Design an enzyme around this catalytic site. Structure first.
Site, PDB file in Angstrom:
ATOM      1  N   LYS A  60      -2.100  16.295   7.807  1.00 33.86           N
ATOM      2  CA  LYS A  60      -1.872  16.562   6.384  1.00 33.86           C
ATOM      3  C   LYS A  60      -2.699  15.610   5.556  1.00 33.86           C
ATOM      4  O   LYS A  60      -3.015  14.539   6.039  1.00 33.86           O
ATOM      5  CB  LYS A  60      -0.411  16.425   5.998  1.00 33.86           C
ATOM      6  CG  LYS A  60       0.299  15.234   6.527  1.00 33.86           C
ATOM      7  CD  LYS A  60       1.812  15.370   6.242  1.00 33.86           C
ATOM      8  CE  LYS A  60       2.517  14.028   6.180  1.00 33.86           C
ATOM      9  NZ  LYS A  60       4.014  14.123   6.133  1.00 33.86           N
ATOM     10  N   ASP A 103       0.805  16.287  13.045  1.00 40.61           N
ATOM     11  CA  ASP A 103       1.101  15.948  11.660  1.00 40.61           C
ATOM     12  C   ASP A 103      -0.135  15.875  10.770  1.00 40.61           C
ATOM     13  O   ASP A 103      -0.226  15.023   9.892  1.00 40.61           O
ATOM     14  CB  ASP A 103       1.873  14.626  11.607  1.00 40.61           C
ATOM     15  CG  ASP A 103       2.676  14.476  10.332  1.00 40.61           C
ATOM     16  OD1 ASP A 103       2.863  15.488   9.600  1.00 40.61           O
ATOM     17  OD2 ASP A 103       3.138  13.337  10.080  1.00 40.61           O
ATOM     18  N   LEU A 151       0.812  -1.222   0.000  1.00 43.16           N
ATOM     19  CA  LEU A 151       0.000   0.000   0.000  1.00 43.16           C
ATOM     20  C   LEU A 151       0.844   1.271   0.000  1.00 43.16           C
ATOM     21  O   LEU A 151       0.579   2.216  -0.758  1.00 43.16           O
ATOM     22  CB  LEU A 151      -0.915   0.032   1.208  1.00 43.16           C
ATOM     23  CG  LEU A 151      -1.838  -1.160   1.387  1.00 43.16           C
ATOM     24  CD1 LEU A 151      -2.812  -0.788   2.459  1.00 43.16           C
ATOM     25  CD2 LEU A 151      -2.555  -1.543   0.099  1.00 43.16           C
ATOM     26  N   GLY A 152       1.843   1.301   0.873  1.00 39.39           N
ATOM     27  CA  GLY A 152       2.754   2.438   0.943  1.00 39.39           C
ATOM     28  C   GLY A 152       4.125   2.051   1.439  1.00 39.39           C
ATOM     29  O   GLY A 152       4.289   1.043   2.138  1.00 39.39           O
ATOM     30  N   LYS A 159       2.144  -1.842   9.291  1.00 41.45           N
ATOM     31  CA  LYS A 159       3.301  -0.967   9.177  1.00 41.45           C
ATOM     32  C   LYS A 159       4.514  -1.750   9.687  1.00 41.45           C
ATOM     33  O   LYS A 159       4.530  -2.210  10.830  1.00 41.45           O
ATOM     34  CB  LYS A 159       3.066   0.296  10.014  1.00 41.45           C
ATOM     35  CG  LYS A 159       4.090   1.396   9.876  1.00 41.45           C
ATOM     36  CD  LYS A 159       3.856   2.432  10.967  1.00 41.45           C
ATOM     37  CE  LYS A 159       4.800   3.605  10.849  1.00 41.45           C
ATOM     38  NZ  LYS A 159       4.282   4.750  11.646  1.00 41.45           N
ATOM     39  N   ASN A 187      -2.007  11.827   5.434  1.00 44.43           N
ATOM     40  CA  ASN A 187      -2.268  11.027   6.641  1.00 44.43           C
ATOM     41  C   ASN A 187      -3.735  10.808   6.876  1.00 44.43           C
ATOM     42  O   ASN A 187      -4.111  10.189   7.870  1.00 44.43           O
ATOM     43  CB  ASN A 187      -1.674  11.710   7.873  1.00 44.43           C
ATOM     44  CG  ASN A 187      -0.159  11.688   7.875  1.00 44.43           C
ATOM     45  OD1 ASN A 187       0.457  11.139   6.973  1.00 44.43           O
ATOM     46  ND2 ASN A 187       0.442  12.244   8.915  1.00 44.43           N
ATOM     47  N   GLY A 229       8.133   4.181   2.413  1.00 45.82           N
ATOM     48  CA  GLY A 229       8.998   5.364   2.420  1.00 45.82           C
ATOM     49  C   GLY A 229       9.471   5.819   3.785  1.00 45.82           C
ATOM     50  O   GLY A 229       9.518   5.027   4.722  1.00 45.82           O
ATOM     51  N   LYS A 251       7.063   0.764   5.729  1.00 42.56           N
ATOM     52  CA  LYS A 251       6.410   0.000   4.679  1.00 42.56           C
ATOM     53  C   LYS A 251       5.079  -0.471   5.211  1.00 42.56           C
ATOM     54  O   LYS A 251       5.036  -1.234   6.179  1.00 42.56           O
ATOM     55  CB  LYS A 251       7.255  -1.226   4.296  1.00 42.56           C
ATOM     56  CG  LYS A 251       8.613  -0.913   3.635  1.00 42.56           C
ATOM     57  CD  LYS A 251       9.725  -1.894   4.055  1.00 42.56           C
ATOM     58  CE  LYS A 251       9.529  -3.294   3.459  1.00 42.56           C
ATOM     59  NZ  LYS A 251      10.795  -4.096   3.434  1.00 42.56           N
ATOM     60  N   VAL A 252       3.986  -0.010   4.603  1.00 42.94           N
ATOM     61  CA  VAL A 252       2.669  -0.543   4.952  1.00 42.94           C
ATOM     62  C   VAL A 252       2.213  -1.426   3.798  1.00 42.94           C
ATOM     63  O   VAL A 252       2.410  -1.105   2.627  1.00 42.94           O
ATOM     64  CB  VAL A 252       1.611   0.535   5.411  1.00 42.94           C
ATOM     65  CG1 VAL A 252       2.070   1.943   5.133  1.00 42.94           C
ATOM     66  CG2 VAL A 252       0.232   0.270   4.791  1.00 42.94           C
TER      67      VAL A 252
HETATM   68  C1  LIG Z   1      -3.791   2.393   4.120  1.00 46.34           C
HETATM   69  C2  LIG Z   1      -4.024   2.150   5.565  1.00 46.34           C
HETATM   70  N1  LIG Z   1      -5.033   1.519   6.120  1.00 46.34           N
HETATM   71  N2  LIG Z   1      -4.901   1.497   7.521  1.00 46.34           N
HETATM   72  C3  LIG Z   1      -3.721   2.142   7.843  1.00 46.34           C
HETATM   73  C4  LIG Z   1      -3.100   2.441   9.043  1.00 46.34           C
HETATM   74  C5  LIG Z   1      -1.912   3.113   9.032  1.00 46.34           C
HETATM   75  C6  LIG Z   1      -1.310   3.549   7.833  1.00 46.34           C
HETATM   76  C7  LIG Z   1      -0.034   4.341   7.878  1.00 46.34           C
HETATM   77  C8  LIG Z   1       1.003   4.062   8.756  1.00 46.34           C
HETATM   78  N3  LIG Z   1       2.088   4.810   8.759  1.00 46.34           N
HETATM   79  C9  LIG Z   1       2.233   5.840   7.968  1.00 46.34           C
HETATM   80  C10 LIG Z   1       1.240   6.215   7.077  1.00 46.34           C
HETATM   81  O1  LIG Z   1       1.513   7.310   6.330  1.00 46.34           O
HETATM   82  C11 LIG Z   1       0.608   8.094   5.602  1.00 46.34           C
HETATM   83  C12 LIG Z   1       1.565   8.917   4.745  1.00 46.34           C
HETATM   84  N4  LIG Z   1       2.605   9.555   5.546  1.00 46.34           N
HETATM   85  C13 LIG Z   1       2.353   8.019   3.803  1.00 46.34           C
HETATM   86  C14 LIG Z   1       1.430   7.411   2.779  1.00 46.34           C
HETATM   87  C15 LIG Z   1       1.012   8.045   1.655  1.00 46.34           C
HETATM   88  N5  LIG Z   1       0.185   7.189   0.952  1.00 46.34           N
HETATM   89  C16 LIG Z   1       0.060   5.978   1.626  1.00 46.34           C
HETATM   90  C17 LIG Z   1      -0.649   4.787   1.366  1.00 46.34           C
HETATM   91  C18 LIG Z   1      -0.597   3.694   2.220  1.00 46.34           C
HETATM   92  C19 LIG Z   1       0.171   3.778   3.378  1.00 46.34           C
HETATM   93  C20 LIG Z   1       0.869   4.945   3.663  1.00 46.34           C
HETATM   94  C21 LIG Z   1       0.829   6.069   2.798  1.00 46.34           C
HETATM   95  C22 LIG Z   1       0.101   5.462   7.021  1.00 46.34           C
HETATM   96  C23 LIG Z   1      -1.942   3.288   6.622  1.00 46.34           C
HETATM   97  C24 LIG Z   1      -3.135   2.574   6.635  1.00 46.34           C
END
Ligand SMILES: Cc1n[nH]c2ccc(-c3cncc(OC[C@@H](N)Cc4c[nH]c5ccccc45)c3)cc12
Lengths: 10, 317
Positions: free
Chosen positions: B132, B130, B13-14, B36, B135, B16, B20-21
């Site tokens: 934004k 934070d 999903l994400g 995460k 998030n 960086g 890593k999620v």
């Molecule tokens: C997608 C999702 N479902 N439940 C959760 C819980 C927590 C996170 C999460 C955890 N840590 C950091 C996160 O960051 C949000 C942004 N800083 C980075 C980001 C941008 N697009 C995405 C897509 C999926 C995960 C992270 C990010 C989110 C994501 C999700």
């Protein structure tokens, strides 16, 4: 587009 | 105990800065989660171990419809990990990018739910720091899910203050760009930035160099599109007041000033938190693995105590 962002901590 | 291999690693999903999620499945119950995955090496290397600890403590002690709830947290011989409810709908930045702008009413829906989460967090002496678009995820029903509690700070009741220079640059409150300490009103500033973006379709301040950016935040007056409603302009002007004391939400009554602003005149704050209000958008998903509201950039990839004494956790729900 508007670029993505990234949090920080000094 | 819950194990790495209690989980299928289905889709990225994400990835960086954070870690890593990955969209996972629980082998036992077949339930779906976002996990995460952080490397302990990375966390210690960067001193920012207290954030990765505080994130867990906060996710353990917070319960709200518009906050991501933690299912399990644990570690391995190499890695810290959180398993959290999955938000199928992607994040708002994705939707906004595509839509370019939301209607005031749509922005009001997400705003109210954010004001709801923040009031709740402030009631618990947590400052989120934070806020934004990135998030702010949406769940399967199109309700806001606040995500990433890394920069949270506990212990912050009323006029208590903080000193860590942190947050996301584009979203920093002016006071945070000055020396010494700041308070909880940074979250309302943050709310104003996301709302401005929702209704005006851009950040109120932007430069790709941070020094100029910071100058803009500290020194430049916001502009508003001519067609923005007077109630919307007023809301944005209040939340992005550069003086935290003059800022909407900056007084001793916190969220109450924001809740009582005329932009929100049509909101029943009890109906918000009780999700009685019909969302303006529900993400259209065919399966549980339908990741259309995430970038194919990230999803199309393949995939592979003393200090953390208070990190591990399992939920009552
Ligand atoms: C997608 C999702 N479902 N439940 C959760 C819980 C927590 C996170 C999460 C955890 N840590 C950091 C996160 O960051 C949000 C942004 N800083 C980075 C980001 C941008 N697009 C995405 C897509 C999926 C995960 C992270 C990010 C989110 C994501 C999700």
């Amino acid at each position: 587009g508007r670029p993505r962002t990234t949090s920080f901590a000094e | 105990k819950v194990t790495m291999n209690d989980f299928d690693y289905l889709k990225l999903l994400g990835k960086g800065t954070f870690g890593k999620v990955i969209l996972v499945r629980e082998k036992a119950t077949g339930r779906y989660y976002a996990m995460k995955i952080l490397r302990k090496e990375v966390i210690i290397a960067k001193d920012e171990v207290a954030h990765t600890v505080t994130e867990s403590r906060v996710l353990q002690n917070t319960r709200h419809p518009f906050l991501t709830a933690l299912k399990y947290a644990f570690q391995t011989h190499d890695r810290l990990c959180f398993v959290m409810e999955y938000a199928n709908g992607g994040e708002l930045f994705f939707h906004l990018s595509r839509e370019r702008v939301f209607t005031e009413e749509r922005a009001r829906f997400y705003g109210a739910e954010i004001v709801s989460a923040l009031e709740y967090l402030h009631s618990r002496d947590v400052v989120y720091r934070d806020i934004k678009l990135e998030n702010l995820m949406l769940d399967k029903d199109g309700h806001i899910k606040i995500t990433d509690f890394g920069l949270c700070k506990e212990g912050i009741s009323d006029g208590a203050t903080m000193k860590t220079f942190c947050g996301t640059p584009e979203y920093l409150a002016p006071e945070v760009l000055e020396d010494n300490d700041y308070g909880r009103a940074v979250d309302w500033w943050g709310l104003g930035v996301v709302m401005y973006e929702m209704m005006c379709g851009r950040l109120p301040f932007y430069n790709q160099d941070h020094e100029r950016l910071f100058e803009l935040i500290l020194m430049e007056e916001i502009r508003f599109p001519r067609t923005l409603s007077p109630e919307a302009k007023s809301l944005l002007a209040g939340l992005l007041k550069k003086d935290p004391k003059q800022r909407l939400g900056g007084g001793p009554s916190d969220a109450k000033e924001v809740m009582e602003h005329r932009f929100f005149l049509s909101i029943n704050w009890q109906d918000v938190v009780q999700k009685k209000l019909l969302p303006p958008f529900k993400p259209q998903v065919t399966s549980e693995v339908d990741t259309r509201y995430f970038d194919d950039e990230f999803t199309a990839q393949s995939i592979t105590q003393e200090m953390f004494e208070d990190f591990d956790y399992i939920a009552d729900w």
